[PDB]
Design a binder for these strands. Structure first.
Length: 960
RNA sequence: GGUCUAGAGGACAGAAACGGGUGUGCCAAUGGCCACUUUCCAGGUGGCAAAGCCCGUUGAGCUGAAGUGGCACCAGAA
């Protein structure tokens, strides 16, 4: 069962007497839920936090005043009851109403309908509370004096109107979601404290004073105004400073800092730290232990994640405006106020919805009416809905491009909404759910485990499936019962998605070439045959000559304005007293990426200051940008540019990540410029374009998994048999010598991979597509066919080429086009096939990582086959390595084993998600026996060995 | 055609006025004017109004016929 909430808009222009009754109805259920929810917070009688400690444990006295007042209100003069039975039944009824407060389970259906009418183990609390004269603990909101409107009179026989049943139930669900929220937040904060405590007791044992001296250093920074990003180049500094003396002039310490920048300006920063680290006070940090600051930089990241987390949740009462709660409805046949969806009551595409119980006002009185048909504004989403049964005004057919047979569905609930509208949830029934099957017939071959849908295979029942479901070659959604196919998707930066289709067939087949295939563990007759592999590109990821020129000029103006602020922030330092602000920033500023207008004015104020004094210059140049940043803001906010009419290929940015980074880089610039709510119109536009990318990228992967192709004028065609298991990449927080930073250093990529996963699970619930993930660590570094690792390179027709010549001094020799050059983020993947240097195996980098996930799927791959973290032990005398048991499968093959060495770079063996570094070394291996004959090689030595193979040859073929 | 395997939509560099509708947003797609926010910039706030918007109907245009919009959507809440 898959629900789809179709939000639509009502038109009430011809009937103001119903709109005013709808806004009033919104205030009735909101003030009602607020009345029923506040009572639950008092019955909770705990801390009850907020944005602070307001109403902190003070509900005990506020409940008693609200509880004692009802004893004299209901004619009770027998057993009064001490202040214990008051608080006893208070917490006892609360844990009885919402079972999520103690860790139990309870659905809000038979809870609100059970406790409302009596109040307006279970039988003991309801009876002992009714003994204390509190038989009427709650008068309903509609019949009391709180509701200013005149509802329909409660009929003789019915206890409570359905309106208050919707308020009392909605208040229970809000408190259920609260206790599960407060507990989960406290549990995550408990694991974060454990992460800090156990990391603190492993690295800072004998170094108790060094931690306190770092807190001296960090407090010295903020009062005068330490992560891994700010320590880039620490070992280079500590190596050259060890050749110096403490009682040396400070210029000598500064001399070594400016030298290490000549090697790599890309990875260096924070000159103020090393200047304050060279002080005679903070020398025990880098002299007593040459790696303490690096060990502490990870400890600061744990506190960074710890500070951005609470140990309690924030409680907010449902206000009718600030924190609104929407008036719910029920499907035609429920037990509360229902609604009926009317198909084509005002026209061909003019729908309407009649409400069985509503409100209407004219001047100042509001009364309850019946059967209020309201037309509905047209929508493309409603075009996919067709009525299935005129006698059942709930059953409906759901249209979708990825299916030629319309799904049978049923209308769900409804709730009237506003923006700071009527949400009609449509329960769409999948094809397998309509056949009477809970899980699809192919859901037994795989086993999605855990939260991230870890896809594991049951090879025993695989042979039985192909014999029951042979390949008849049916295209589209009709072929879900035909054969078995798995599509591996690798979300990338340049190409939005690189996919590869593998079918399972026996023996062999096939104008005369032989298709690629992957061996499947267990069965020796069937083998995963590669069917097709293509690049799925959203509009905006195609690179041409004219498109680059458009992208360069739209960024060059922001390139000039953003780098200008960096020079203005260097000038504001020269107007201070500290040497780091005045002295160091002065000598620095005393190749044309600036605005020539502001560049000329900046050099003028500099030369005038070369001969509070800078405070005038720092505020005269700031006004100059105000002229430039305004003429540029209005040029972006209201300037007219060409826009796509119809369907146009070769788009500028489109749905690419470049368009998302552009919208973000503007928000990050306006936030950094004004601070020398915020941009509500731009921020909401960034989230919309980001939300639009996730929805479009999740549908294109699914439409490809089903075999539909959008061809040109614009029509989806079922061109391939459908896949049955969308194999995604496993997502993890840590990265260790795997992806080139851009596709991971960009904290946007993690949002993309997280957002695509959530949207894929939702959209694939209708098509019965199994969404699973495979471990993606080092999926782009190793080859899929040969299994040998390699460096990422690309061709040549430059950000990467100029740095490639600085490394290898290739300014003299020329080169012909289409020569392989490693960049780190290479467009193509290269790998050695044999021991012959010069002979390599080239393949698209993003597609090789996708096909690598497939090889991991049919072979039950584990990272223990490649990577392994060991500890330095002393087993049987020698100083051998001891592997670490991360995961049950890693432990099976390396339990009793132990790794020894004679050189330190090559290791031989003799018989969570947290990582502590540098305590011992990590080693990896090559499956093809090419690099180091397939032995366990140290991490740094192994990748340099691979780089020496590929990058060694293709450069030796350039100089010669 | 050059280069690269996975042999596919292959892959990187190349080259030649009237009548209706305005669910939520994307696709070079971030609204304008005025007032105020101490003063110009960013951000915010309030007020104002005309429409901008697509879609349908042709005589326009020759890029006699053709074509002047494509795409996706599962909501909600601190």
């Amino acid at each position: 069962m898959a629900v789809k909430s179709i939000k639509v808009k009502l038109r009430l222009d011809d009937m103001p007497e119903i709109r005013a009754g709808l806004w009033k109805l919104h205030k009735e259920v909101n003030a009602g839920v607020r009345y029923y929810t506040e009572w639950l917070s008092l019955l909770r009688q705990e801390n009850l936090y907020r944005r602070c400690d307001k109403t902190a444990e003070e509900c005990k006295a506020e409940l008693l005043e609200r509880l004692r007042a009802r004893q004299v209100e209901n004619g009770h003069r027998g057993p009064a009851g001490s202040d214990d039975e008051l608080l006893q039944l208070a917490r006892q009824l609360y844990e009885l109403l919402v079972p999520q407060a103690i860790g139990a389970k309870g659905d809000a259906q038979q809870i609100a309908r059970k406790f409302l009418s009596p109040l307006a183990r279970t039988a003991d609390v309801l009876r002992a509370l009714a003994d204390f004269g509190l038989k009427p603990l709650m008068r309903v909101y509609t019949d009391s004096e709180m509701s200013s409107v005149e509802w329909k009179p409660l009929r003789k026989g019915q206890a409570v109107r359905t309106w208050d049943r919707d308020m009392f139930q909605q208040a229970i669900e809000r408190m259920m979601s609260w206790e599960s929220w407060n507990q989960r937040v406290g549990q995550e904060y408990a694991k974060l404290v454990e992460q800090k405590n156990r990391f603190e007791q492993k690295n800072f044992v004998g170094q108790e004073h060094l931690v306190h001296l770092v807190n001296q250093l960090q407090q010295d920074m903020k009062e005068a105004s330490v992560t891994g990003r700010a320590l880039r180049g620490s070992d280079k500094v500590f190596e050259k400073w060890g050749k110096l003396a403490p009682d040396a002039p400070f210029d000598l310490y500064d001399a070594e800092i400016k030298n290490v920048q000549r090697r790599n300006t890309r990875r260096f920063g924070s000159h103020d730290l090393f200047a304050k680290l060279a002080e005679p006070e903070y020398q025990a940090l880098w002299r007593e232990d040459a790696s303490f600051l690096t060990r502490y930089a990870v400890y600061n990241s744990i506190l960074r994640k710890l500070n951005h987390a609470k140990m309690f949740a924030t409680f907010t009462l449902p206000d009718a405006t600030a924190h609104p709660i929407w008036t719910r409805f029920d499907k035609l046949g429920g037990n509360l106020h229902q609604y009926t969806f009317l198909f084509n009551e005002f026209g061909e595409r003019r729908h309407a919805i009649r409400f069985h119980k509503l409100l209407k006002v004219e001047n100042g009185v509001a009364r309850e009416v019946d059967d209020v048909t309201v037309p509905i504004s047209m929508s493309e989403q409603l075009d996919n809905l067709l009525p299935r049964d005129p006698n059942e005004p709930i059953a409906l057919y759901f249209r979708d491009y990825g299916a030629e047979q319309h799904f049978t569905g049923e209308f769900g609930g409804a709730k009237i909404q506003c923006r700071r509208y009527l949400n009609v949830s449509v329960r769409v029934q999948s094809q397998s759910e309509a056949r009477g099957e809970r899980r699809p017939p192919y859901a037994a071959v795989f086993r999605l485990v855990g939260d991230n849908h870890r896809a594991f295979v049951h090879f025993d029942k695989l042979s039985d499936y192909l014999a029951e479901h042979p390949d008849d070659g049916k295209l589209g959604s009709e072929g879900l019962l035909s054969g078995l196919r798995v599509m591996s998707v690798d979300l990338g930066l340049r190409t939005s998605a690189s996919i590869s289709v593998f079918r399972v067939a026996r023996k062999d087949e096939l104008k005369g070439r032989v298709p690629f295939f992957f061996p499947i563990k267990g069965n020796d007759n069937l083998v995963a045959v590669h069917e097709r592999s293509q690049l799925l590109k959203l509009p905006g990821e195609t690179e041409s000559k004219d498109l680059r020129a458009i992208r360069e000029e739209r960024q060059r103006t922001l390139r000039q304005l953003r780098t200008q602020l960096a020079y203005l922030r260097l000038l504001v330092r020269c107007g201070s007293e500290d040497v780091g602000r005045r002295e160091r920033s002065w000598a620095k500023l005393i190749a044309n990426h600036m605005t020539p207008d502001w560049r000329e004015a900046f050099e003028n104020e500099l030369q005038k200051l070369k001969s509070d004094a800078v405070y005038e210059s720092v505020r005269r140049v700031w006004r100059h940008m105000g002229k430039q940043v305004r003429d540029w803001r209005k040029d972006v906010r209201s300037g007219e540019r060409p826009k796509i009419r119809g369907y146009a290929k070769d788009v500028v940015g489109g749905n690419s990540i470049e368009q998302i980074e552009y919208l973000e880089r503007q928000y990050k610039f306006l936030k950094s410029w004004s601070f020398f709510r915020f941009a509500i119109t731009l921020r909401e536009h960034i989230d919309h374009a980001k939300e639009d990318r996730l929805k479009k990228l999740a549908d294109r992967i699914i439409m490809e998994a089903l075999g539909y192709v959008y061809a040109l004028k614009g029509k989806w065609v079922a061109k391939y048999p459908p896949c049955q298991l969308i194999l995604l990449a496993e997502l993890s927080e840590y990265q260790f010598n795997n992806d080139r930073p851009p596709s991971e250093n960009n904290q946007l990529m993690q949002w993309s991979h997280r957002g695509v996963f959530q949207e894929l699970i939702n959209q694939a619930q209708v098509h019965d597509l199994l969404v699973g993930t495979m471990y993606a660590a080092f999926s782009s570094r190793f080859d899929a066919r040969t299994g040998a690792p390699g460096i990422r390179c690309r061709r040549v027709p430059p950000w990467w080429l100029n740095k490639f010549v600085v490394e290898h001094t290739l300014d003299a020799c020329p080169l012909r086009a289409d020569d392989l050059i490693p960049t780190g983020e290479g467009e193509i993947f290269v790998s050695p096939f044999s021991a012959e240097e010069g002979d390599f195996h080239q393949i698209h980098a993003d597609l090789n990582a996708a096909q690598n996930l497939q090889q991991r799927l049919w072979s039950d791959f584990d990272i223990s086959q490649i990577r392994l973290r060991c500890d330095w032990g002393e087993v049987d005398g020698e100083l051998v390595l001891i592997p670490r048991l991360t995961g049950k499968r890693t432990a099976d093959s390396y339990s009793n084993k132990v790794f020894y060495t004679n050189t330190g770079v090559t290791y031989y063996e003799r018989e969570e998600a947290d990582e502590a570094r540098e305590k011992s070394v990590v080693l990896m291996r090559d499956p093809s026996g090419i690099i180091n004959r397939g032995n366990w090689t140290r991490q740094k030595e192994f990748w340099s060995m691979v780089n020496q193979r590929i990058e060694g040859y293709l450069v030796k073929q350039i100089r010669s």
